[PDB]
Amino acid sequence: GEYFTLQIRGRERFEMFRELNEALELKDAQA
Amino acid sequence: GEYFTLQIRGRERFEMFRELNEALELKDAQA
Amino acid sequence: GEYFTLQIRGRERFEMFRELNEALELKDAQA
Amino acid sequence: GEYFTLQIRGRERFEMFRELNEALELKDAQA
């Protein structure tokens, strides 16, 4: 369990990955 | 709100997308 | 190497995964 | 066109996003 940084270039593509990470984070917030 | 099919070639890559869809689906199952 | 189907519900989210698959497919088209 | 950082927790999940970003980056390297 470690923390990694994902620096991507652009703006819209970064939002796509942000959505996939938004649901995963929701898993940790499944209370 | 419609249903779309994503047919990908390979096997491991398909699992990656499956994980991103596993959390999104978890959002719908946030009960 | 097999073919799998990824049926997702919604419309915008499907586009996100479509982009990640658009680049991967571009890898196979790296000629 | 800007640069954003995606800090995710874990280790395997970060690899998944790294793959989707590996192909996108390959698009910029389509020479």
Swiss-Prot record, chains A, B, C, D:
There is a cross-link at K27 (Glycyl lysine isopeptide (Lys-Gly) (interchain with G-Cter in ubiquitin)). Changing R11L: In a sporadic cancer; somatic mutation. Residues 1-31 are annotated as: Oligomerization. Induction: Up-regulated in response to DNA damage. Isoform 2 is not induced in tumor cells in response to stress. Changing G10W: In a sporadic cancer; somatic mutation. Changing A29T: In a sporadic cancer; somatic mutation. Changing Y3S: In a sporadic cancer; somatic mutation. Changing E25D: In a sporadic cancer; somatic mutation. Residues 1-31 are annotated as: Interaction with HIPK2. The modification Symmetric dimethylarginine is found at R11, R13. Forms homodimers and homotetramers. Binds DNA as a homotetramer. Interacts with AXIN1. Probably part of a complex consisting of TP53, HIPK2 and AXIN1. Interacts with histone acetyltransferases EP300 and methyltransferases HRMT1L2 and CARM1, and recruits them to promoters. Interacts (via C-terminus) with TAF1; when TAF1 is part of the TFIID complex. Interacts with ING4; this interaction may be indirect. Found in a complex with CABLES1 and TP73. Interacts with HIPK1, HIPK2, and TP53INP1. Interacts with WWOX. May interact with HCV core protein. Interacts with USP7 and SYVN1. (Microbial infection) Interacts with cancer-associated/HPV E6 viral proteins leading to ubiquitination and degradation of TP53 giving a possible model for cell growth regulation. This complex formation requires an additional factor, E6-AP, which stably associates with TP53 in the presence of E6. It is linked to TP53 is found in increased amounts in a wide variety of transformed cells. TP53 is frequently mutated or inactivated in about 60% of cancers. TP53 defects are found in Barrett metaplasia a condition in which the normally stratified squamous epithelium of the lower esophagus is replaced by a metaplastic columnar epithelium. The condition develops as a complication in approximately 10% of patients with chronic gastroesophageal reflux disease and predisposes to the development of esophageal adenocarcinoma. Belongs to the p53 family. The N-terminal and C-terminal disordered regions undergo liquid-liquid phase separation (LLPS) following homotetramerization and activation. Post-translational modifications, such as phosphorylation or lactylation affect the ability to undergo LLPS. This is Cellular tumor antigen p53. The chain holds residues 325 to 355 of 393 of the full protein.
